[model samples]
Target: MVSKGEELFTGVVPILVELDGDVNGHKFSVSGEGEGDATYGKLTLKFICTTGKLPVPWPTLVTTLVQCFARYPDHMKQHDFFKSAMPEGYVQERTIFFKDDGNYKTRAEVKFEGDTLVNRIELKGIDFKEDGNILGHKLEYNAISDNVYITADKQKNGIKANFKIRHNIEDGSVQLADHYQQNTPIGDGPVLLPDNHYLSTQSALSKDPNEKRDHMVLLEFVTAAGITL
Candidate 1:
């Protein structure tokens, strides 16, 4: 009932990834599954990563963001990931798809209405504009392949604010270090966490040093569905 190169992974659900070697034991749940025997169904999975901080240096952060784009393609549509990442008093208004007259509008928006970090998709006919609050924005070097790992966000009220990072499957590297060195001191890279995972850190630039903060993200896959083959 099966051919060569056709295999199925069973009992992949309810998996746990324990932190590999830190003295402190940290564990989280991960699930992934495939559906159908010959016919294919939807493939779904949730990836969690504790990057420990945000705005990570160009080199490290790019990798982290890339993984998320691959593992959580449905991330924007899911409320849990988006809602949890939202800043205090911030609300996301995202339209994953915009269709008119049964015609699909390939572009959409993942806008945030708090601290002026608004993210909207730009279509061919529409012109893109940067709000005054947005200080800097750029894409990874592998934009051609991993274009999904692009970033969008804004800085508000003298605080580095909210943003979104998406990914794709490109094996190119970005010279973020050079860019960062030209702008500010690029300190530290991503941390290789336990369980073959990684953590990238980024600190907020604020007038008050004490107010500096970090954003953490965990990147790992979960089984979503199983195939019938």
Candidate 2:
């Protein structure tokens, strides 16, 4: 077992880089990118959390999360709530994993496409034996957000990107601020938190709403953020 002091990345869990926990305090962040043909592309959807202590590892972290899901399943139901959660993306499939001690583990992954996820693995559990030979992958999307574009031809349409941050007090629920918005040109959002605090910034640019197509949004976070879908 990994000791709390020996843990290298401080709050970051090496297994899941964006997650961290202390006594009863929790902080999280996740980020990703999407690429595809010129017609469709995006690079947005990074979320972070600053509040309440989350589970550590082993029986503590996984078990607590399961209970939290059971107690507040609705939290995951909200489209916006999923922006910064890992399990939130797991809804698409149920995957299982195995521990060296024989206990089974479970996890999920999402294959996102332009402004949407093309595929996802919900609760997909992989036994210990399958470690080296699991042949499977989800499709990725192109609808994403970009923060920098100088040339006129580079401007994209129907694009949106945002960086969100929230910290739960003893009460529950953190404050949030999204500062980036764009329609034609790439406008970078602010990176709110880098060291340790509750804040985030996001920027989104897309085409006119009337066009009706997968939107793309790009952004950069204070720290690398996390995503649900």
Candidate 3:
């Protein structure tokens, strides 16, 4: 009976975001990924963005470096409107969580091992549509923060790079002109950071750049630890 009531009062959908990075040597030195969310149907998803040299060693390097992500909120949602939703997953033997706040913060790394780049993607929070389908569109998630920093990795010859991304919620169905300028261009004013862990910022490159990035994002259920709620 309690489960039924919770179902009726399903949590709001979080924002959705995507990012692309590469190893440009001098071109890729501690850069920030912009942030923004697209509204498709009634869902909004949010994510972070950053790029830098890959940490040394295999799985272990990625392992310790990923610790930074643990600080984000987990995001969870449903694929079928009538069914319960869980926000966790497994990647290469690694267990992940998708609870609100801490889990929404997933990480995808591009290892530029001498030009040949390999993507190690790990998403913590994921909410599907009523029919169990991911949103139809794939939008780019730009960096949303003014500062970009990197910490030395636990492993030798490894470095961990991180940046706070700017993001906000907007109508998904609405077409944005000059995608790059839609959420960036002006530092604008300030953005609201949801949860205590994350601090949203303004994107310097957007069409309506004056508005804060965090405000555009919608309320999404956080998830983590491969634990389905």
Candidate 4:
């Protein structure tokens, strides 16, 4: 009848993240996007081509990163509960597996409430290859998890998400932070390169910061491209 019925909204919330930078000598670079209707309450992100040699050793990187994020700063119950449940520098006692080249790689699964990442539910991966390596050239995995952006009375935090640069390495085969414990972080480290790719101390010392370029890893939220929110 009249103009007293309901409100209307449009567009599915979308998300994006770019991981690019240099860890000492090695380099890391990657990008991905995700979105949801909010009504359906699910978000799925897919990253491709994990290219890098590891920065530091895998175990050291894992433990250090865990300790760095050992404490989440959110005051929400879910965040607190998740944080408390974990060890001061806690991580899984066991390591997860990796997928094959050109395989559908499902990394970590996550969950969020309102606008905060409440908990990282589970870390997923396939077994390692016989050659002690997993091919991640075309890494493709979709993590469909629950989320809340709208409700009975409120329109919550848009896909105002944080696509962080959890971990990055430099090798020509692995993606940054993709297979590292379904992890999280925001820093760069040294990429231990193969001897052929490695740089001598004297030569490395001779180059200036500008001459020695470093890649970038970013997790920025933008309502539209070029304008980071």
Candidate 5:
């Protein structure tokens, strides 16, 4: 029988424009596997290793990312978007949840957001209390730290977004930080968590005891089966 698998985007892999001033600065990307995802459909399909040792969907079947190193100074709206685009039919969803003292609350839900999301997939969208006003988002990568920083908006309320997250590197746990507090880390929760569960931290800008309690955040990147939904 013929082979069932062959790599695509092989022709356009690893591309860079190789110019600056005249071009007004630019960034290019090629497809690659999920940097944080793993398996699919009951742990069926497996992605290539060099493709970021991720599970299915988080980018399972994709191509590599290419970026320019030109340190442009006056770069307005600074960004390095390796943002993932969903397939024509296949959909990806990003939902945010916040927890105060009790259970986690759903704040926002957007489709196909962020790059190479691996952990925190089986979570849910719920809001029993209040949505942690600290609007959350996957911040652009911080090359200096050689780490990706997760943060929320301090714009909504006085609830300082005293939180930052990264899908842990070696520990396979959530790499959380609160530079605002000059705190190196808060806590790290394991990736494989209970259904409808999430990682939590004990930090906040409020002092209501509850508001100052476990403030949790979760990003669940998932898609339906059959590559249809």
Candidate 6:
């Protein structure tokens, strides 16, 4: 376990580089970019915890994450998946969808040609009209609000995936704000008087006064794939 007092960039958990600030109360966001000359693409990690809990150390967290990624890349990517593109000319986009039925899966990859982006959906099982027919769709992302919308094709008369997603923003580890309760003694009572104390709690609990919250770290890997596809 990495101690709560470990300084940023110190050897507490050598593999990870701590970002500018923490996420939830006890959870600080960490990233695994490259170790030595080896690169693991890009990864953003969060150490989830209950109210008043410690963040997991980099080594312990990354070691488990590496094992899970190697053992179940496909499964892991479904939840931790994030990819986007930026270019002056051409574009390529890929997305995966799971069907309502327990056993079907689909992957769609689109490549831009001249004016329009062409996409093909591959299904693992029989294609049903309600599920498999994926026409061209436009996905819109609002960076300021962190909201995503899959509405009717914004441009030409093409197919669209009608859906909406709301993203959540959180800061360093979870903590108690303020409350109090009375409880009976648990163990053997003291020689004569019963043990009694005020159990006060606070939602806004901070171990370090200097620590800040709600900061995010983003990493991108870019490649040159020419002007057009």
Candidate 4 — what's its lDDT? 0.24
Candidate 3's displacement at residue 182, Å, is 30
lDDT of 5 at 43: 14
lDDT of 4 by residue, 145-186 (tens): 111111111132111121212222233344333222223211
TM for candidate 6 is: 0.16
**Model 3, range 66-90, lDDT digits (tens) per residue?**
1111112224221111112112111
Winner of 2 and 6 under lDDT = 2
- lDDT of every predicted structure (CA atoms): 0.21, 0.22, 0.23, 0.24, 0.19, 0.21
Lowest lDDT 10-mer window, candidate 4? 196-205
Query: CA shift at 75, candidate 1, in angstroms?
Result: 32
Clash count list over all predictions? 36, 52, 63, 14, 13, 17
Q: How do the residues 125-169 of candidate 5 rate in per-residue lDDT, one tens digit apiece?
A: 233222222112222212111212223222321111222333222
Tens digits of lDDT, candidate 6, 39-78: 2322233322222322322211111111111111222221
TM-score versus the correct structure, for each prediction: 0.18, 0.18, 0.23, 0.23, 0.18, 0.16
Q: Candidate 2: what lDDT?
A: 0.22
Better of 4 and 5 by TM-score: 4
* RMSD (Å) of each candidate, 1 decimal: 21.7, 22.1, 19.9, 18.8, 21.4, 26.1
The TM-score obtained by model 5 is 0.18
